[PDB]
């Protein structure tokens, strides 16, 4: 052993990397109850000071808010408060149960409970200071807790101010829980799975009416993404194509491979010294693609994701299959060129060479498909029925329980369509070929009756098909559009030739699990966009009515496409964002985002003003004004009307920076008001009152321009200020140039302040809704279809 | 479709090996490639079997290199 | 004193471009008869990029 | 298809650059213009052919 060492400085290059998830692996959600009850206000003891501005032997109780951590700017004020809705919502419970969070009072005179920690260290402050009246005292013994169980109803005594006892009592009133019986547990599961006799249900359990569940918000896609939005719509297909891949059933028994397939050979009777064209019918004949076309189709007629086809033409059974495929699937469900080239080959090998007629002479875009045009050049009532019925068929658009739905003609389901396409072809069988050879026709309808030869399995396979197709469209909340995807999946038809070739006399039904784990799924992602929805657009329609030019509406469809564990948001561009945005615009907020930004709005300033480091404004009037008298502070130089003098908006000035006008009025000793959040400071001294300290802080504005190091100066003058000796002998009442635009806070009343909080007792909350009801099915053979009549029974 | 109008560019690529364009996002690009696909399956093996290899990735992006010279490594 | 080129004045401010786009959407959502659909279909969408 | 929410306009320092510029050298144009057009009428008077 010997070792020695060298390094190598690598970059290090960290892109986005989007991750990822799939549907049955997004967690639904987790649901908020409540903690603490939001407070903005708290009360505070403060010094008070009598008229004359001396000082009391007593203190008194003042709101004050929680966290004063507001900016420099209304710009930013109005991001400050943005920001809290924000946190309102992030807070903003759906169920509460008060008890949890409830504590005791150490001075009630029964010995009562209250709501919150805070609410009893208040009631517990007030009564243990001196200098508190007794009233309050008799107030804080009597309330306590009072229940009326025949209701299940609490009223709990809360201290509060007014604001949070609307943002709190709105969280009461409107808590999404509704009673839960098994009735509702029934009626969440679709009417067709409950109207189909193939399912079973039970449960054994009895919920009470105590308990409560909440029910999803499965309102239909607002934003309708099958409109112009085809790449993320590209993106949902997909992510819906393959959760609906991972439900259609594998197949039970099949037959035998290497004997149908030495049947096939029999019937096709071979020769080891040619090259014969039937041979290419064997290619892929396996299992677990049989299985892969069942569920590719399945899960692409579900999801509506369109599928294109891949086929070589030395093989004439791929073409075969595709007659019966196009006959049973529509043809809108197909991308164009796939289908043209299909029935190009079906048309230039099985039908006008079997009537003696040309080739074709068709143009690559023809506003015709071939079976089209080609419907009117027969004269064979078989043949022409057939391809009228394959070129008009199409889905049906029909809304059923709210989701709109891609259905089938009702001709397809009930088998019979295999009839009028065995009549073609028998009618074709019977033809000879006047242009080509008897070998060719040999080949040919040799190969037909390879398929002729499975015909009850076939009618049995397409209403399966047709059953599991409607069984697993009830399990879908998001209505299904048909529109074409950007993107196919290749379809095999030598796997096609496998399934149909591969099949018997034993019948797949989902299983429930299956069914329910699947409609869980797509409930939850349903739920989630609309209330990452919500959320977005109540955000996007308040910023449209609060003037916050600055802000890029782009980080917000981010966090809601990021909420979406499924896109790939470093690629998604913004443009798109936009239009996203867009739309987001139009829509209508819910009841509990709308309600609570009303309550926000109307009380937004005046939460602003409070917060004692900023104030609303400032008064600069050329003459010696006096003073005003309050009782938190003493003597000050406020203003709360700002009346008469007039006022210039500062963000107008920061926007569009011209100080012509401000230098030109503050030269000329022109009486105005500059409204606009402003720092100060608190000058408690009296020698810089004289002295008119707070003239001297504008004139900088004409030195340096920037507007933001702009402090206007308080004079609160009281008997705890030094220098009070002053006013009390020389006889003088302050007065005081450049007074503040500033509103006081508000004095607590103690008992106008109380309030009873309102709310239940004692439910209980469900959230996996579907655990309760177990559910089987009846044997697979004998199942049955919406005709009343056994699916998988021909022989 | 060489012709008049046309040109041609060819290029020796053989000492790209050491490069800044091999190491990081050439792995990483094949790192995203297979989470995509992860996603693009239902089964568990197949999952399984992709993680594999994107561990196998990992484990390249670093990687060290014994050369003798004479007695010392 | 000096010679200028100005513009239209629904060019200074962007609203000429509604009208080209209210054309360009007309063009996608338009079929083409003789064309083919591959070259069809990618023509349409990179019509609605716009 | 690469743009959006990212204005840039000319700073007044590049203006009054391309202005000082503009100015200068049309300046320039109509100075050396008078030149040429003296001496060469001052050729033409003073019969220097």
């Known amino acids: 052993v010997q070792y020695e060492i060298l390094q190598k400085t690598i970059p290090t290059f960290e892109p986005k990397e989007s991750i990822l998830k799939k549907l049955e692996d997004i967690k639904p959600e987790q649901v908020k109850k409540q903690t603490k009850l939001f407070r903005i206000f708290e009360p505070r003891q403060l010094p008070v000071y009598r008229a004359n501005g001396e000082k009391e032997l007593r203190n008194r109780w003042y709101w004050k808010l929680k966290r004063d951590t507001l900016p420099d700017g209304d710009y930013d004020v109005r991001e400050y408060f943005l920001n809290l809705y924000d946190q309102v919502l992030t807070e903003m419970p759906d169920y509460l149960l008060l008890k949890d969070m409830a504590v005791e009072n150490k001075n009630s005179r029964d010995a009562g409970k209250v709501v919150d920690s805070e609410t009893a260290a208040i009631c517990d402050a007030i009564f243990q200071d001196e200098e508190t009246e007794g009233v309050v005292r008799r107030f804080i013994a009597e309330m306590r807790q009072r229940v009326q169980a025949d209701r299940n109803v609490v009223n709990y005594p809360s201290i ?226 057939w391809l009228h019925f394959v070129n008009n068929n199409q889905f049906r658009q029909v809304v059923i329980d709210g989701v709109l739905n891609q259905v089938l003609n009702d001709n397809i389901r009930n088998g019979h369509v295999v009839n009028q396409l065995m009549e073609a072809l028998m009618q074709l069988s019977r033809q000879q070929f006047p242009t080509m050879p008897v070998d060719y026709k040999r080949s040919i309808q040799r190969g037909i009756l390879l398929l002729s030869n499975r015909l009850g399995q076939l009618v049995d396979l397409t209403r399966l098909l047709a059953y599991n197709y409607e069984t697993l469209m009830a399990c879908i909340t998001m209505n299904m559009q048909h529109v074409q995807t950007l993107t196919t999946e290749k379809l095999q038809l030598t796997s096609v030739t496998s399934l149909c070739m591969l099949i018997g006399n034993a019948t797949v039904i989902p299983s429930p699990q299956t069914l329910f784990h699947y409609y869980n799924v797509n409930v939850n992602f349903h739920s989630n966009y609309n209330e990452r929805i919500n959320d977005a657009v109540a955000i996007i329609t308040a910023a449209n009515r609060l003037n916050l030019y600055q802000k890029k509406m782009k980080s917000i469809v981010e966090d809601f496409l990021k909420r979406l564990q499924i896109f790939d948001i470093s690629r998604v561009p913004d443009d798109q964002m936009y239009r996203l945005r867009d739309r987001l615009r139009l829509l209508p907020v819910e009841i509990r985002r709308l309600d609570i930004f009303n309550l926000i709005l109307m009380n937004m300033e005046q939460i602003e003003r409070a917060s004692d480091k900023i104030a609303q404004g400032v008064i600069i009037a050329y003459r010696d004004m006096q003073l005003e008298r309050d009782e938190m502070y003493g003597y000050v130089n406020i203003a709360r009307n700002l009346d008469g003098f007039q006022q210039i908006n500062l963000e107008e000035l920061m926007r569009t920076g011209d100080y012509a006008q401000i230098t030109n009025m503050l030269l000329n000793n022109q009486p105005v008001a500059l409204v606009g959040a402003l720092p100060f400071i608190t000058d408690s001294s009296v020698i810089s009152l004289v002295a008119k300290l707070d003239a001297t802080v504008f004139a900088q504005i004409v030195k340096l321009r920037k507007v933001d190091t702009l402090k206007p100066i308080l004079y609160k003058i009281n008997s705890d200020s030094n220098d009070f000796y002053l006013v009390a002998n020389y006889d003088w009442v302050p007065t005081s140039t450049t007074k503040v635009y500033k509103q006081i806070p508000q004095q607590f009343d103690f008992r106008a302040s109380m309030h009873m909080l309102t709310s239940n007792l004692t439910f209980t909350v469900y959230s996996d809704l579907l655990a309760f009801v177990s559910a089987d099915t009846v044997e697979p053979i004998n199942a049955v279809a919406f005709d009343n009549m056994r699916i998988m029974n021909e022989l | 479709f060489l012709s008049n109008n046309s040109m041609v560019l060819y290029t020796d690529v053989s000492q790209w090996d050491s490069s800044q364009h091999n190491t990081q996002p050439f792995r990483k690009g094949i790192i995203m490639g297979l989470d995509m696909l992860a996603n693009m399956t239902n089964d568990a093996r197949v999952i399984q079997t992709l993680n594999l290899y994107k561990q196998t990735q990992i484990n390249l992006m670093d990687s060290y290199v014994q050369i003798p010279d004479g007695n010392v490594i």
């Open chain 1, 160 to 385: 509060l101010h007014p604001i949070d006892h609307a943002f709190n009592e709105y969280f009461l009133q409107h808590q999404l829980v509704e009673p839960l019986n098994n009735d509702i547990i029934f009626n969440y599961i679709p009417e067709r799975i409950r109207n189909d006799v193939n399912y079973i249900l039970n449960m054994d359990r009895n919920l009470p009416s105590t308990a409560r569940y909440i029910r999803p918000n499965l309102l239909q896609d607002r934003l309708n993404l099958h409109d112009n939005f085809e790449s993320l719509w590209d993106t949902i297909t997909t992510s819906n194509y393959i959760l609906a891949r991972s439900v259609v059933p594998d197949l039970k028994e099949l037959v035998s491979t290497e004997a149908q397939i030495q049947k096939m050979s029999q019937d096709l009777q071979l020769e080891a010294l040619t090259i014969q064209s039937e041979t290419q019918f064997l290619t892929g004949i396996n299992s677990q693609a049989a299985n892969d076309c069942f569920k590719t189709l399945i899960a692409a007629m579900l999801s509506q994701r369109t599928m294109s086809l891949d086929f070589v033409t030395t093989n004439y059974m791929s073409l075969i299959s595709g007659m019966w495929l196009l006959t049973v699937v529509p043809n809108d469900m197909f991308i164009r060129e796939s289908l043209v080239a299909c029935q190009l080959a079906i048309i230039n090998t099985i039908i006008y060479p079997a009537f003696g007629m040309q080739r074709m002479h068709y143009r690559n875009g023809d506003p015709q498909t071939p079976f089209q045009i080609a419907e009117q050049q027969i004269q064979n009532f078989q043949v022409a029925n």
